């Protein structure tokens, strides 16, 4: 491209349906090798990672680069949580416990103090500075690989009976039975562990 966007800060308008146009700002994390129209984005103040075709998607308005990519932190501590099952503590009403079982997947690209994490009851991709949670006591560490899967189309049958269509876009290095799937009808990155029973309904082509 004339100008790269991976690793850059970006802003764009968002126009979905007939809601008033809003402004989004974020950092482009990655351009998916197997589908380079698709980018993973971390938006300011938004926990879940977005997968958006930033150039093709009609909802993305007036895309701008706010600043270019720049150069790149206890890595030993990071390595003790990467690939581990965890209990991740959030707050419910008036500071009560709201504890979620999950899996720390990786350090995020670009934003290296940030970690990829997903949850057994909510298997989509999130990003947090988990060493802060850890140091505060809010992250407890707890006590199926397929050849040639990247780029494969995937579907499962929804309750509605229709097929939900997507593509496998990434394998997690620290846990190689774990893959990222992007479905056509949504912006989340779905995270499936093919060793788990929760994955048995996926059909690949």
């Amino acid at each position: 491209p004339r100008r790269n966007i991976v690793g850059c800060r970006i802003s764009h308008g968002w126009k979905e349906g007939d809601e008033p146009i809003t402004q989004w700002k974020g950092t482009v994390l990655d351009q998916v090798p197997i589908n380079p129209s698709l980018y993973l984005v971390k938006y300011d103040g938004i926990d879940c990672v977005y997968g958006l075709e930033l150039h093709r998607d009609e909802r993305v308005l007036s895309l701008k680069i706010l600043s270019d990519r720049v150069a790149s932190s206890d890595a030993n501590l990071a390595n003790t949580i990467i690939g581990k099952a965890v209990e991740h503590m959030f707050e419910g009403e008036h500071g009560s416990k709201d504890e979620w079982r999950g899996m720390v997947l990786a350090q995020a690209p670009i934003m290296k103090a940030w970690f990829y994490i997903t949850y057994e009851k909510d298997p989509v991709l999130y990003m947090y500075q988990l060493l802060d949670d850890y140091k505060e006591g809010d992250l407890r560490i707890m006590p199926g690989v397929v050849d040639g899967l990247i780029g494969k189309h995937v579907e499962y049958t929804k309750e509605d009976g229709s097929k939900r269509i997507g593509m496998v876009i990434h394998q997690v290095e620290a846990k190689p039975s774990v893959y990222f799937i992007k479905f056509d009808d949504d912006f989340h990155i779905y995270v499936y562990d093919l060793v788990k029973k929760s994955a048995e309904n996926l059909y690949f082509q």
Binding site: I46, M89, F90, D98, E136
Partner: peptide, 8 residues
């Protein structure tokens, strides 16, 4: 600790 987010 953090608080879980809703959709916008």
């Amino acid at each position: 600790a953090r608080t879980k987010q809703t959709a916008r």
